[PDB]
From Swiss-Prot:
This is GTPase KRas. Changing residue 22 to R: In NS3; impairs GTPase-activating protein stimulated GTP hydrolysis with unaffected intrinsic functions and a virtually functional effector interaction. The gene is KRAS. The lineage of its organism: Eukaryota, Metazoa, Chordata, Craniata, Vertebrata. It catalyses: GTP + H2O = GDP + phosphate + H(+). It comes from Homo sapiens. Keywords: Acetylation, Cardiomyopathy, Cell membrane, Cytoplasm, Deafness, Disease variant, Ectodermal dysplasia, Glycoprotein, GTP-binding, Hydrolase, Intellectual disability, Isopeptide bond, Lipoprotein, Membrane, Methylation, Nucleotide-binding, Palmitate, Prenylation, Proto-oncogene, Ubl conjugation. SMART domains: RAB, RAN, RAS, RHO. It is linked to Leukemia, acute myelogenous: A subtype of acute leukemia, a cancer of the white blood cells. AML is a malignant disease of bone marrow characterized by maturational arrest of hematopoietic precursors at an early stage of development. Clonal expansion of myeloid blasts occurs in bone marrow, blood, and other tissue. Myelogenous leukemias develop from changes in cells that normally produce neutrophils, basophils, eosinophils and monocytes.
Length: 169
C-alpha cells in the first residue's frame, strides 16, 4: 500500500520509454512513439517493503505548462536519463535538474542520474564525466541498458531508496 510516485525525464530518444517498459513488462521495445506520455503501475518488493510504483514516462512539452508543473509537484522522485552516445542529452540534464527544483521550490528533491544505452559500443560521455556531474548534485549515478536489463532494477530501486531517505528527515 505505500505508493511511490516516480517521474522519468530526459531528452527525446534517450530510452525513457524503453526503460519503463523493461521494468514493468520485462521486454525491450524496439519502437515506441516518441510523443506518447503515459503512466504505469506495478507492485514490487523493495528491501522487504511491498509497495506500488506509479511511474510517469514523460514525453516533453505538454499541451499547457500547468500540466508539466502538476506532475513535477506531485512527483516524489525523478529519474534523469541521458544516453551515453548523445552528448546533447547529457548537457540537457542541467535543464531538467534546474526545472524540477524550480517547480517544487526546493533544494532537496530525490533524483538519480541514469546513463542509458550502455550496451552500445558508441560512447561520447565517459563514466567519469557523469560521475563528476552526479557528485556535484549529491545524487547516485547508474549506467543502464534497457536492452540487456543491466542496471534497470537498480536505477528504479535506488530512486525509491532516495525518496525514503528524504522522507525520514
Ligand atoms: N541499444 C539500445 N537501444 C535503446 C536503449 N534504450 C532505448 N533504446 C532505443 O533508443 C530509441 C529511443 O528509445 P525510447 O525509449 O523511445 O526513448 P524516449 O524518447 O526517451 O522514450 C529506440 O529506438 C529504442 O529501441 C538501450 O538501452 N540500448
Ligand atoms: Mg518515450
Amino acid at each position: 500500500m505505500t505508493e511511490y510516485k516516480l517521474v522519468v525525464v530526459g531528452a527525446c530518444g534517450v530510452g525513457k520509454s524503453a526503460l519503463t517498459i523493461q521494468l514493468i513488462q520485462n521486454h525491450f521495445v524496439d519502437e515506441y512513439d516518441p510523443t506518447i506520455e503515459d503512466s504505469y503501475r506495478k507492485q514490487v518488493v523493495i528491501d522487504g517493503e511491498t509497495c506500488l510504483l506509479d511511474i510517469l514516462d514523460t514525453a516533453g512539452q505538454e499541451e499547457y505548462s500547468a500540466m508539466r508543473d502538476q506532475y513535477m509537484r506531485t512527483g516524489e522522485g525523478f529519474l534523469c536519463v541521458f544516453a551515453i552516445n548523445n552528448t546533447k542529452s547529457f548537457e540537457d540534464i542541467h535543464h531538467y535538474r534546474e526545472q524540477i527544483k524550480r517547480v517544487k521550490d526546493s533544494e532537496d528533491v530525490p533524483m538519480v542520474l541514469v546513463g542509458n544505452k550502455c550496451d552500445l559500443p558508441s560512447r561520447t560521455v565517459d563514466t567519469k564525466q557523469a560521475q563528476d556531474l552526479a557528485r556535484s548534485y549529491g545524487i547516485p549515478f547508474i549506467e543502464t541498458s534497457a536492452k540487456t536489463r543491466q542496471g534497470v532494477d537498480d536505477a528504479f530501486y535506488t530512486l525509491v531508496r532516495e525518496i525514503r531517505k528524504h522522507k525520514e528527515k
